[PDB]
Design a protein around this ligand. Structure first.
Ligand SMILES: NC[C@@H]1O[C@H](O[C@H]2[C@@H](O)[C@H](O[C@@H]3[C@@H](O)[C@H](N)C[C@H](N)[C@H]3O[C@H]3O[C@H](CO)[C@@H](O)[C@H](O)[C@H]3N)O[C@@H]2CO)[C@H](N)[C@@H](O)[C@@H]1O
Ligand SMILES: NC[C@@H]1O[C@H](O[C@H]2[C@@H](O)[C@H](O[C@@H]3[C@@H](O)[C@H](N)C[C@H](N)[C@H]3O[C@H]3O[C@H](CO)[C@@H](O)[C@H](O)[C@H]3N)O[C@@H]2CO)[C@H](N)[C@@H](O)[C@@H]1O
Ligand SMILES: NC[C@@H]1O[C@H](O[C@H]2[C@@H](O)[C@H](O[C@@H]3[C@@H](O)[C@H](N)C[C@H](N)[C@H]3O[C@H]3O[C@H](CO)[C@@H](O)[C@H](O)[C@H]3N)O[C@@H]2CO)[C@H](N)[C@@H](O)[C@@H]1O
Ligand SMILES: [Mg+2]
Ligand SMILES: [Mg+2]
Ligand SMILES: [Mg+2]
Ligand SMILES: [Mg+2]
Ligand SMILES: [Mg+2]
Ligand SMILES: [Mg+2]
Ligand SMILES: [Mg+2]
Lengths: 62, 90, 254, 50
RNA sequence: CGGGGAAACCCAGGUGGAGGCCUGUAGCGAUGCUGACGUGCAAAUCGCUCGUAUGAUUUGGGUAUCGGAGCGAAAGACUCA
RNA sequence: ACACGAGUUGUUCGGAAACUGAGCACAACGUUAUAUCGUUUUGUUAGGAAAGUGAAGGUGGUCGGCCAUAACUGAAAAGGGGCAACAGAGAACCUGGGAUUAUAUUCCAAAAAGAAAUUGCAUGUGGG
RNA sequence: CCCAACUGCAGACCGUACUCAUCACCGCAUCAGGUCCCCAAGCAUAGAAUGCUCUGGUACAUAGAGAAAGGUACACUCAGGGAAGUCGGCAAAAUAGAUGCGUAAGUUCGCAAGAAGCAUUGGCUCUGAGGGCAAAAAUUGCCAACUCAGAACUGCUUACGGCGGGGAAUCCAACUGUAUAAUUAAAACAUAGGUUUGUG
RNA sequence: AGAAGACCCUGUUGAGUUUGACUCCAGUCUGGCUCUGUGCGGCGA
RNA sequence: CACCGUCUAGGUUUCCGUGCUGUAAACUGAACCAACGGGAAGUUCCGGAGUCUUGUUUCGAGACAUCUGCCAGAUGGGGAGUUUGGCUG
RNA sequence: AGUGGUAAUGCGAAACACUGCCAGGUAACAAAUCAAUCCUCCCACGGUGAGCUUUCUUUUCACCAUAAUCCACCUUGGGCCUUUUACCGCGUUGUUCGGAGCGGGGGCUCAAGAUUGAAAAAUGCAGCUCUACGUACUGUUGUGAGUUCUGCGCAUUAACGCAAAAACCUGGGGUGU
């Protein structure tokens, strides 16, 4: 209680809570798991618009 | 040298408890203190902590299951059944 | 002339459970809106032993549905449950080991555990170590699922009652002999006061109906009626048949 | 020992101030009745147990 | 670590420190002398001998269960001589 | 033993203030001809409106758009009180003394024999 | 208004003596009974065994004088015989540490087992091994702390304390454990193991 | 000496325990009405 | 007996759907105290965040008993009270 | 509106200032083996006093002390980083470890100590010397044995898996903007 904050923490994120091998394993999965959904979200909107000209292009075919 | 003939870990108990109840306990006292295969981490390192609790000494993975052996033979029958039944829905 | 020991355990004084080192009650998470319509995902953080069970527990971490917090949930684990697993929980959850989904959604012939006998009571059937229920059929007119309990006794339950998928963890336990009265001391240490077990014939006639005599014999026939009073109902209570069961294996129960 | 409540210490303090003899001039009054104290408590013979 | 073998596996020297293991203090009990004492040191004690002594072990404080009731590894034992 | 006279000194030591445990049972509710009865920690009372605390802002005397001090409005905190451990938790003081007939990690006074640690509140100096 | 280092002032309540036991508590009492915790020296020795000793404590438990018979002992011996004593080897005797060798039937192969049974042991003077850290370093320097084996020489009156007697079978209970405080500790009870019943 | 025989018997004296003794009582079960309402019917008299 | 009115809207899907933005073996991240927009920088009022209540907290059972109270009968050493003649070499 | 180092992570006179809400950690528990701290015992060095002396004994006995609290920072056990990549190697009395990164080379840290200092000689003890609880001076090793403090735990036999909470600590997010 009487000590400075520096004997109980360290200068980076989650310092004094998490270690160096798992601060980085959260930085890496905060990037790779967010970006994996962006690949699957933009794949989903690209599929529904290809449906929007697979059948709306059949208005000029019968 | 070789220290006993056929009482292995059960030589702990001496001339007690009957020959065959030492032998039913022998296959499961050997099994729970043997290190099993960490399929997560590739190593032979699963040691049982408490009853039903296993822990890869290389991978620090804690797996529930099996009182004296890591995977009981009724589990692998179940894992195949769940894997088959999720293929019929996809 | 004095009160029988089996009648005395219902006062529950020296004979209550030994629960100080127990964790909380193991149950499924609350059947909220988030499972009646979607799935909640959790994550297994620890596999736990409490005193007086042979099955492993698990703390699964959900997010609270309505508040900025996370809910620690103590479930009893199936076999193969590892820390990190991402349990899914609800209607739209897939069919995998560890997931908890309604019995209407689990296709037939599937091994389930922590099945609940009415919707919402958070798991009452198949929770001892190594046990499981098998789903036999579904009825869509009545909306009920009929499954085989671990005794073999069938039971029809509503198809909105959910169940976890798997064997209960910690199985194979009874197959090792105890070998010692010391090892039975510590087995019943975290349970309750019910050991050592003194036979009724070893007692005096004041304590038990079987006690007394010059030879240790039960005098009267030891199969008592269903309608015997407390104190008189000791022995083989309402035995339909006795003796060494020579033949098949009848399911026991009403 | 060392622990006592103060309400037990103040009862043990009253009995020390009662454990004193009859003075001599009591024995010289007119309608005298008292020779000795009849309530002289000794710590070994009879116990207060406070 | 050494040795034998085509292999299955056997054979030896250490290492290690398992056990309701053994001898044996303290502790906890109480076998025999049918010892001493038996208006005692004592309304149950003394002496030597004996049981056990890592365990179903011993123990303090705190708590909870009682009168036709309590508690009991069960002797109708124990519940302030 | 008896009579008489004395003797126990604390910011830090033990307790309480101020922890929780096995448990207890006040309120509430139910019961009972009768409360002297039951429930009352598996997260936790009571058919069960037991929070009197207050984020942010508005109102108008203070310190260089931040504070801080005074009175209206209202986000957010489900789950009433109190006990139970002088061996568990917690806990800021250590020596020296020629200082007693008897107390001391308790008394020692300007060279405190002295050396500290800690809590509350306050000035001044200095910094934003 | 925030903060630092300092300073200035104040730091409340209760306990505190003595005991904790062969005299301070409980057993009617200054009762050989019981009663939780901490500190814990030297030598012999495996040693919280047991014997003796510096520190601390004590000489307090009615004493004196003193060869009866009879007793009681945490006291001894006893020639020849050696359980003939006796319900019964009850009581005593005997065995004994350590080291080397050796060990049967039976067996759940773990044991039985310290089976049984043999041998050695002193004192003294030496000789071998078993190491460190300081500069073919495969060797020159210096040095602690002990243990074991061997060897001559010499002595025994077998000489502290402490410390299994052993074997062949029969009965019963598997085992360690519990158990009639104050006449029964057992073969009883418990136990693991086996079975049954009720129960979704 | 110890102590109104702990054996035995007597008493219209007990008490612990037992049970197809005698008289009952809780408990368990079973029937009746009740709590107990709303519809479409069916077997009945 | 007809009609009207209460009675409105909607993720996804090529009318269906039935309240929906995430997963379809699983491998330990994050998520709060509203951004933004409209209609009349600060207010007020809306949307974001659908509206509606012949009302039940929600699910299951349901006039059963898994409820309540009285009668009625079987059982009933679990327990209570009491008794267990007399004469008598 | 904190800031260094590739990184393990560093830097505190007063802004590296504050905490509706959230999440962690501390409190917080565990064998045996080996190594073992304070301290005790012994041995070795000596100094002071005392005891023995027909003989012997470079001799026997006593004493030789350093409290908290600071301050500055050589070992031997943990964790890790970076660089070389290694599939036999490192290591323990001991049941094992390594491409999921061994071993070397450089490091960063943590824990237990050691050391220099402030306290502290002014104190303590035993001697002794001088004209009254008086004074002036003199003195202040150990590869021995025992030590649970520690190393020490996701830590014991286990169908035994080993309390809780207050109080506190750090972060996330926000404010400062
Ligand atoms: N991979 C290295 C190998 O080591 C080998 O060395 C091994 C052999 O020389 C030798 O093997 C022996 C052998 O004598 C003989 N022919 C057969 C015997 N089984 C082996 O014995 C070996 O295995 C037994 C287990 O049974 C162990 O007890 C023991 O440790 C070991 N000696 O002992 C060594 C193992 O420790 C050879 N050098 C060669 O094959 C090769 O270099
Ligand atoms: N149930 C009524 C009670 O019967 C008791 O007396 C009864 C008992 O003495 C005795 O009951 C016995 C019972 O002891 C014994 N252990 C079992 C036997 N089944 C019973 O028997 C009685 O009950 C069954 C019906 O269940 C009848 O078949 C039978 O006729 C009848 N004697 O038979 C008597 C007739 O019932 C008591 N007199 C009294 O408590 C009360 O009347
Ligand atoms: N009201 C008296 C109380 O009833 C309770 O005891 C009752 C229960 O033990 C027991 O209840 C049983 C129940 O266990 C069982 N599962 C279902 C059965 N319906 C009930 O039975 C009871 O309840 C119903 C209620 O209407 C009555 O119809 C029936 O007559 C009655 N015997 O019957 C007993 C008599 O009612 C309490 N245990 C006790 O404190 C007390 O005697
Ligand atoms: Mg023994
Ligand atoms: Mg009897
Ligand atoms: Mg006096
Ligand atoms: Mg005494
Ligand atoms: Mg002879
Ligand atoms: Mg009767
Ligand atoms: Mg240790």
């Amino acid at each position: 209680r009487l000590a400075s904050r520096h004997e109980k923490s360290v200068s980076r994120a989650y310092g004094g809570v998490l270690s160096h091998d798992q601060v980085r394993d959260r930085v890496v999965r905060a990037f790779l798991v967010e970006e994996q959904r962006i690949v699957k979200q933009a794949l989903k909107e690209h599929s529904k618009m290809k449906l929007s000209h697979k059948r709306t292009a059949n208005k000029k075919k019968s | 040298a070789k220290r006993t003939v056929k009482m292995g870990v059960m030589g702990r108990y001496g001339t007690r408890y009957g020959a065959n109840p030492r032998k039913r306990a022998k296959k499961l006292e050997v099994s729970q203190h043997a290190k099993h295969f960490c399929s997560f981490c590739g190593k032979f390192a699963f040691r049982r902590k408490a009853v039903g609790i296993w822990r890869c000494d290389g991978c620090s993975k804690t797996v529930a299951g099996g009182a004296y052996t890591l995977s009981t033979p009724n589990n692998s029958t179940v894992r195949s059944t769940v894997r088959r039944l999720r293929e019929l829905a996809k | 002339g004095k009160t029988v020991l089996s009648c005395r355990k219902g006062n529950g004084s020296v004979y209550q459970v030994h629960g100080h080192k127990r964790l909380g009650p193991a149950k499924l998470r609350i059947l909220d809106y988030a499972e009646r319509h979607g799935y909640m995902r959790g994550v297994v953080k620890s596999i736990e032993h409490e005193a007086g069970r042979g099955a492993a527990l698990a703390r699964v971490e959900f997010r609270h549905p309505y508040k900025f917090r996370r809910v620690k949930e103590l479930m009893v684990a199936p076999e193969g449950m590892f820390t990190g697993q991402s349990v899914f929980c609800g209607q739209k959850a897939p069919l995998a080991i560890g997931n908890v989904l309604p019995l209407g959604q689990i296709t037939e012939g599937c091994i389930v555990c922590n099945v609940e006998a009415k919707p919402g009571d958070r798991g009452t059937l198949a929770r001892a170590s190594g046990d499981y229920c098998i789903i036999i059929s579904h009825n869509h007119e009545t909306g009920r699922t009929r499954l085989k309990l671990p005794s073999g006794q069938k039971k029809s339950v509503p198809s909105t009652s959910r169940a976890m998928i798997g064997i209960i963890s910690g199985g194979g336990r009874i197959e090792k002999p105890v070998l010692k009265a010391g090892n039975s001391f510590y087995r019943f240490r975290g349970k309750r006061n019910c050991w050592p077990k003194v036979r009724g014939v070893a007692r005096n006639p004041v304590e038990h109906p079987h006690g007394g005599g010059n030879h240790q014999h039960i005098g009267h026939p030891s199969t008592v009626s269903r309608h015997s009073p407390p104190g008189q109902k000791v022995g083989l209570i309402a035995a339909r048949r006795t003796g060494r069961i020579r033949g098949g294996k009848a399911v026991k129960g009403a | 020992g060392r622990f006592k409540p103060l309400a037990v210490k103040k009862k043990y303090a009253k009995k020390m101030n009662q454990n004193k003899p009859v003075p001599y001039w009591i024995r010289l009054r007119t309608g005298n009745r008292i020779k000795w104290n009849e309530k002289r408590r000794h710590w070994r013979r009879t116990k207060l147990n406070y």
